[PDB]
A paper describes a structure:
WD40 proteins are a subfamily of propeller proteins with no intrinsic enzymatic activity, but their stable, modular architecture and versatile surface have allowed evolution to adapt them to many vital roles. By computationally reverse-engineering the duplication, fusion and diversification events in the evolutionary history of a WD40 protein, a perfectly symmetrical homologue called Tako8 was made. Tako and Ika are the first successfully designed eight-bladed WD40-repeat proteins for which structures have been confirmed crystallographically.
The eightfold symmetry of the protein is reflected in the water structure within the central cavity, which is 11 Å across. The crystal-packing interaction is mediated by a hydrogen-bonding pattern with eightfold symmetry. The difference between the two crystal forms arises from different water-mediated interactions at the outer rim of the toroid. The individual repeats of the Tako8 protein can be perfectly aligned.
Residue numbers in the entry: 1 to 320
The structure:
Amino acid sequence: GQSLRTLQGHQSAVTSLQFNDNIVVSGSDDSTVKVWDIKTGQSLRTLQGHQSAVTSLQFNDNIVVSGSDDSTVKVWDIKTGQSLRTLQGHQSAVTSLQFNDNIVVSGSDDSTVKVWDIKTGQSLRTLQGHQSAVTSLQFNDNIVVSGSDDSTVKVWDIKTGQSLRTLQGHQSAVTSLQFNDNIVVSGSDDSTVKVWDIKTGQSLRTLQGHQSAVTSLQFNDNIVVSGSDDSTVKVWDIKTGQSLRTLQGHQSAVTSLQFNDNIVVSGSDDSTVKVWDIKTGQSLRTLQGHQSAVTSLQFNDNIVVSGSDDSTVKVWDIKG
């Protein structure tokens, strides 16, 4: 439950983060990405180049990929801080991204998803069809799934670029999504989570119970965990579509969550992170220390890392 390090240096909100056993990488409204030592707290390098807020990022052993309100995606050499490619083509903010060894996939306020060659920096495909901002995306070797402010989820063939399915039924923006070989799970401003058959496009379940927008979700074979503007996290049985637990305790919207077999970790506009026993619904720990909303988090067996509107990242001992 104890704060281990406070990573100070960003000049505005932290929007996004990822960590491994050695480093934290954070993206900020101040238009930079920072690389930090997870154990010492030291700022290691600052990736400067974007002209507006960084919204989204991912990294591996060689590169960082960042997306920005300036409408670009940048690829950086994590080992030197040098900008390797700027992916230009979107007409408005990049909101979401994912990459693998070959390709970057980006989503934008311009309503499109683009597929790029990560080595050359050239666009391969533009996925056209949404009628408003793309908010979220995921891909694999075969398909892209995108969620949009137009209230739909779209499933695309990643090699050809063709729309395969448009999942219709949400009554407001899709905020979040995840998929596997069988199902798509989407969360919406309409306060529901929906489960869909990815091959047929059939709506399989509507998880009803939240009293305001669903902001975040994760699922596995057994359960969905959702976070909401109503300040709760809900745990659902995916098979019946019924809620198992409501995790109550946050005083404002839940913005972010992650779970494993034992625990849920949630971040909130109330400035705290909470650790919960997923089996019982009980709060195990409240991580107090941020001075404004928690926007983003990640955890493992040992530590939580949280990012905040207060411009800091914090590293916590998740046990005590």
